[PDB]
Amino acid sequence: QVNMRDMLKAGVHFGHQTRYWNPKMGKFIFGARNKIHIINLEKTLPMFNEALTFVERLAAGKNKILFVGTKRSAGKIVREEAARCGMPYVDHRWLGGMLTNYKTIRQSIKRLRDLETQSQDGTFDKLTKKEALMRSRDLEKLERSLGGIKDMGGLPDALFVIDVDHERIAITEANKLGIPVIGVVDTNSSPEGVDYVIPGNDDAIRAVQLYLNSMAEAVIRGKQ
RNA sequence: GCUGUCGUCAGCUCGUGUCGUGAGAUGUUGGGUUAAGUCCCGUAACGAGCGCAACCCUUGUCCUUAGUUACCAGCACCUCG
Numbered sequence: 001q002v003n004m005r006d007m008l009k010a011g012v013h014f015g016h017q018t019r020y021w022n023p024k025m026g027k028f029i030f031g032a033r034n035k036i037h038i039i040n041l042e043k044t045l046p047m048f049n050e051a052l053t054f055v056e057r058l059a060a061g062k063n064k065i066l067f068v069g070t071k072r073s074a075g076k077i078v079r080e081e082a083a084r085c086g087m088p089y090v091d092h093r094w095l096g097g098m099l100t101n102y103k104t105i106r107q108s109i110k111r112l113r114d115l116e117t118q119s120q121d122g123t124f125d126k127l128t129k130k131e132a133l134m135r136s137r138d139l140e141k142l143e144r145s146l147g148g149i150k151d152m153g154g155l156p157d158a159l160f161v162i163d164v165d166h167e168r169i170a171i172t173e174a175n176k177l178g179i180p181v182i183g184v185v186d187t188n189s190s191p192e193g194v195d196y197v198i199p200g201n202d203d204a205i206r207a208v209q210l211y212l213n214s215m216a217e218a219v220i221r222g223k224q
Numbered sequence: 225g226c227u228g229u230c231g232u233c234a235g236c237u238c239g240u241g242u243c244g245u246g247a248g249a250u251g252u253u254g255g256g257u258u259a260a261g262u263c264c265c266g267u268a269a270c271g272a273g274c275g276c277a278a279c280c281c282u283u284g285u286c287c288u289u290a291g292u293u294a295c296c297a298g299c300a301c302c303u304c305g
Contacts, residue, residue, distance in 0.1 A: 093266090093267085094268095095268085095269070095270070096241070096242075096250095096251090096267085096268035096269025096270060097240085097241045097242070097268070097269060097270065098270090099241095100240090100241055100242075101240055101241040101242085101268095101269080101270065102241095103239095103240060103241090104239085104240060104241080104269095104270050104271055104272095105270075105271095107270090107271070108270075108271075137263095137264090169242095169268065169269090172242085172268095173241095173242095176242095
């Protein structure tokens with residue numbers, strides 16, 4: 001599936017500075033070089049296919065997993081990879097409580113998807129003046145924060161994270177509701193809320209696509 | 225029941241969510257902006273309500289309808305009204 005040689009090409013071994021390292025990555029660190037911690041690979045791959053093995057199962061069970069990466073680096077890649085598997089996502093900001101407070105999120109989703117019908121039905125022309133608040137402030141805002149989670153339906157069956165520290169609000173919500181989490185952890189990350197860890201670079205552009213492309217192909221294989 | 229007042233000051237809250245053993249906090253803070261909690265951007269908050277504003281009268285321009293008791297541009301009459 002995924003070779004070790006492809007990993008170092010994407011720079012998955014590179015982490016952060018030794019100052020910011022998290023002691024709980026001591027088991028995932030092969031060593032350090034020029035004041036930069038480098039992640040062990042011989043443990044990364046066997047743990048990496050297990051994440052691909054798990055997502056294989058629930059994809060066959062027709063289960064929804066959320067593609068959340070909110071960093072500006074891995075912003076667009078998450079959205080495009082989620083769409084390829086036709087799978088919901090969030091990449092601008094983890095809003096406070098889509099999971100523990102899904103009830104009001106559904107109300108925001110309701111005003112979202114009804115609002116597209118207003119554009120489709122041509123009701124916009126009936127308002128004419130004082131309309132740009134609807135056109136930009138009202139559609140375009142809602143397409144950002146809930147664009148991916150529009151057709152998601154129910155509660156997630158698993159959660160995919162990038163930079164679990166930056167996207168830490170998501171971890172607490174998923175853990176409280178007992179949602180399994182598969183996130184990429186750097187040398188500065190805390191693997192205490194996530195369940196299926198894989199260690200590697202989490203802000204390099206090459207690294208994030210390698211996860212997401214492998215993440216997506218394990219979902220497309222499971223649609224059958 | 226009705227009325228003055230802070231004060232037409234711009235604030236006051238609520239439902240879920242979250243944090244804290246708890247009273248409580250968040251939202252409502254922060255960076256700009258406004259007459260305004262007005263709006264924008266961030267943001268464990270999302271939304272909502274009462275407030276602000278607007279919808280309401282009057283006034284400042286024009287158009288359509290109408291010219292009596294109102295008006296008199298162009299006509300004639302006329303005591304010169």
